[PDB]
Amino acid sequence: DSEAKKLLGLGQKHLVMGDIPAAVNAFQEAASLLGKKYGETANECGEAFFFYGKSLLELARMENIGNLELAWDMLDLAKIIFKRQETKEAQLYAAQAHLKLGEVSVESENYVQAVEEFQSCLNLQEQYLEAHDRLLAETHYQLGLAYGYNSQYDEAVAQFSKSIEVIENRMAVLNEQVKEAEGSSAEYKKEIEELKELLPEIREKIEDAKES
Amino acid sequence: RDNIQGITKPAIRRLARRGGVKRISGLIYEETRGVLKVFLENVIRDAVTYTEHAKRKTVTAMDVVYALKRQGRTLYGFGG
Amino acid sequence: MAKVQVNNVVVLDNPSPFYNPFQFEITFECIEDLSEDLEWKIIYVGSAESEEYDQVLDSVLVGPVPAGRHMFVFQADAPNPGLIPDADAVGVTVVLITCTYRGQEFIRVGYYVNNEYTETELRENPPVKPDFSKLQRNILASNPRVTRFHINWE
Amino acid sequence: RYRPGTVALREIRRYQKSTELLIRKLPFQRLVREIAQDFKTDLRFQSSAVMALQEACEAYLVGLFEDTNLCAIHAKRVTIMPKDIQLARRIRGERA
């Protein structure tokens, strides 16, 4: 059982390293152990199945049952396991599973399902997070992407502007916190400037979507 | 006289599975056929209206998209 | 043009007894000044079989609506049980928040609501005629359905 | 790779294949033409238009069935019912 958590950590480190095949192998072994022990529905398999589906999505993306199909299966199982549990951690993990389902849908050229999954993730995130969370910006960005792919360019620029809006709100909140905090005078400004570096490419996406 | 259907029972089962349904009742087939007929009636009425306004004799995919935009769009949240 | 956007809806006083009024904290936004009237409505679906058993619990008519963000608590009385078919009383049904501009409905928010008994004896052996004083209403607020319709905003 | 069993896969939503259309073309097209004829009109439908109608109907029904299965998950039902379909229609903004 401890080896399953070791496999999970190894797979996460491999995904961050960029060795997607090794990450897929480790996550697959961990998911196999958890499913053979607790059952392919129990709560202990949630994170394992989620990371398995995420690694399968990374594999499919690098390559550019099928990888996208198996990723959808694992992520939807994980989404079920998370949604059935009524805690904040589980709900945010279910939102992440929805986000990964939407990304798998984008890679599968199924943009309607992609916009549905991104909307579900955003609903969970907005009801369990604060209005200046970087995750909300990320989800709005993915949603605008899906809108642009689906030729809904008005909604695309709307979602991109919403991501910009939440980024700027977080910038203002962090400026307030760096002004009203004592002993942490640099991390907030560094994160502000990181978001400022992120902003212009989102504006370029706005322009590109306006171009259609 | 004519009970012409446009969708088959295997197709209904495949769509239910894509929706995530695990078990369907017997009346699900007739219910699904009825709702599909209502939807098609509304969309076809709007598309034929657009086509007859445009004074064309053949409804095109653009006519269909224009009619579909009139049906209303369901989102799974407010920020989307 | 999408001149009015419902940014959020928060279900208050949930769960609650069936007889408790619906309370929705609605936050919307007007892109510009509105020359005509907005009308909010709460609609209870007393029967999935027929729309004839929809009860408009309450309606709020405002106008003109100025530009900017607005937030208000729409409160409506519980549906009349005498009009609800007994078979549709216990179980899942739908509540709706409709908004209308210039007579045209442009947004329809929908929630599943689960009316059930709290006493386990009543849950296991439900009475022949539903006891709404013992029913508890639980609005499935975490899964809203917002349906946007295209209207002429002039 | 490791895949979950079939019993587990019955619990999730079947993965959508991009190319596949779930509604067969010929009887659907006959239904479309029958409705058009019922509208007292001699218009013919292009293949692009009937394919757009097919895809629209498929997406409409799959979303409807998702919300039907949600409604049935609540009220603790294993099998979905016409009442579940009707409640899904109602909650998805559909109006007579």
Curated annotation (Swiss-Prot), chain A:
Entry coiled-coil feature ranges: 157-212
Tissue note: Isoform 1 is testis- and sperm-specific.
Quaternary structure annotation from Swiss-Prot or TrEMBL: Binds to linker H1 histones. Interacts with histones H2A, H2B, H3 and H4. Interacts with histone H3.3. Interacts with histones H3 and H4; NASP is a histone chaperone that stabilizes and maintains a soluble pool of histone H3-H4 dimers. Interacts with ASF1A and ASF1B; the interaction is probably indirect and mediated by H3-H4. Also binds to HSP90 in the cytoplasm; this interaction stimulates binding of NASP to H1-6/H1T.
Gene encoding the protein: NASP
Family per record: Belongs to the NASP family.
Originating species: Homo sapiens (Human)
TPR repeats: 4-37, 95-128, 137-170
From-to range in the entire protein, with total length: 40 to 659 of 788
Function: Component of the histone chaperone network. Binds and stabilizes histone H3-H4 not bound to chromatin to maintain a soluble reservoir and modulate degradation by chaperone-mediated autophagy. Required for DNA replication, normal cell cycle progression and cell proliferation. Forms a cytoplasmic complex with HSP90 and H1 linker histones and stimulates HSP90 ATPase activity. NASP and H1 histone are subsequently released from the complex and translocate to the nucleus where the histone is released for binding to DNA.
Signal peptide: none
Protein name: Nuclear autoantigenic sperm protein
Subcellular location: Cytoplasm; Nucleus
Swiss-Prot record, chain B:
Keywords recorded for this protein, A-Z: Acetylation, Chromosomal rearrangement, Chromosome, Citrullination, Disease variant, DNA-binding, Hydroxylation, Intellectual disability, Isopeptide bond, Methylation, Nucleosome core, Nucleus, Phosphoprotein, Ubl conjugation
Record location of the Glycyl lysine isopeptide (Lys-Gly) (interchain with G-Cter in UFM1) cross-link: 9
N6-lactoyllysine modifications at: 9, 55, 69
N6-(beta-hydroxybutyryl)lysine modification, residue list: 9, 55, 69
Residue(s) carrying Phosphotyrosine: 29, 66
Known outcome of mutating residue 72 to R: Found in a patient with a neurodevelopmental disorder; uncertain significance
Modification after translation, per record: Acetylated as part of spermatogenesis progression prior to histone-to-protamine exchange. Demethylation is performed by JMJD6.
One cellular-component annotation, GO: extracellular exosome
Signal peptide range in chain numbering: none
Residues modified as N6-glutaryllysine: 9, 37, 55, 57, 69
Sites bearing Phosphothreonine, chain numbering: 58
Boundaries of the shown chain within the full protein: 24 to 103 of 103
GO MF entries: DNA binding; protein heterodimerization activity; RNA binding; structural constituent of chromatin
Gene name per UniProt: H4C1
Phenotype for residue 10 to L: In TEBIVANED1
Organism: Homo sapiens
Annotated protein name in UniProt: Histone H4
From Swiss-Prot, chain C:
From-to range in the entire protein, with total length: 1 to 154 of 204
General function of this protein: Histone chaperone that facilitates histone deposition and histone exchange and removal during nucleosome assembly and disassembly. Cooperates with chromatin assembly factor 1 (CAF-1) to promote replication-dependent chromatin assembly and with HIRA to promote replication-independent chromatin assembly. Promotes homologous recombination-mediated repair of double-strand breaks (DSBs) at stalled or collapsed replication forks: acts by mediating histone replacement at DSBs, leading to recruitment of the MMS22L-TONSL complex and subsequent loading of RAD51.
Subcellular location(s) per record: Nucleus; Chromosome
Impact after mutating residue 49 to A: Loss of interaction with TLK2
Tissue-specificity statement: Ubiquitously expressed.
Keywords: Chaperone, Chromatin regulator, Chromosome, DNA damage, Nucleus, Phosphoprotein, Transcription, Transcription regulation
Impact when changing residue 108 to E: Reduces interaction with histone H3
Region feature Interaction with histone H3, CHAF1B, and HIRA, mapped onto this chain: 1-154
Full protein name: Histone chaperone ASF1A
Motif (Required for interaction with HIRA): 31-37
Impact when changing residue 88 to A: Loss of interaction with TLK2. Reduced phosphorylation
Main location: nucleus
Similarity annotation: Belongs to the ASF1 family.
GO CC field: chromatin; nucleoplasm; nucleus; protein-containing complex; site of double-strand break
Species this chain originates from: Homo sapiens
GO molecular function, one term: histone binding
BP-aspect Gene Ontology terms: DNA repair; DNA repair-dependent chromatin remodeling; DNA replication-dependent chromatin assembly; muscle cell differentiation; nucleosome assembly; osteoblast differentiation; replication fork processing
Swiss-Prot record, chain D:
Phosphoserine PTM sites in chain numbering: 18, 47
Any one GO molecular function term: DNA binding
Location (main, coarse): nucleus
PTM text: Acetylation is generally linked to gene activation. Acetylation at Lys-83 (H3K122ac) by EP300/p300 plays a central role in chromatin structure: localizes at the surface of the histone octamer and stimulates transcription, possibly by promoting nucleosome instability.
Modified residues (N6-crotonyllysine): 17
Keyword Cell cycle applies: no
N6-acetyllysine PTM sites in chain numbering: 17, 40, 76, 83
Alphabetized UniProt keyword annotations: Acetylation, ADP-ribosylation, Chromosome, Citrullination, Disease variant, DNA-binding, Hydroxylation, Lipoprotein, Methylation, Nucleosome core, Nucleus, Phosphoprotein, Ubl conjugation
Listed GO biological process terms: chromatin organization; epigenetic regulation of gene expression; gene expression; nucleosome assembly; telomere organization
Disease: Glioma: Gliomas are benign or malignant central nervous system neoplasms derived from glial cells. They comprise astrocytomas and glioblastoma multiforme that are derived from astrocytes, oligodendrogliomas derived from oligodendrocytes and ependymomas derived from ependymocytes. The mechanism through which mutations lead to tumorigenesis involves altered histones methylation with gain of global H3K27 methylation, altered Polycomb repressive complex 1 (PRC1) activity, aberrant epigenetic regulation of gene expression and impaired differentiation of mesenchimal progenitor cells.
Name the record gives this protein: Histone H3.1
Organism: Homo sapiens (Human)
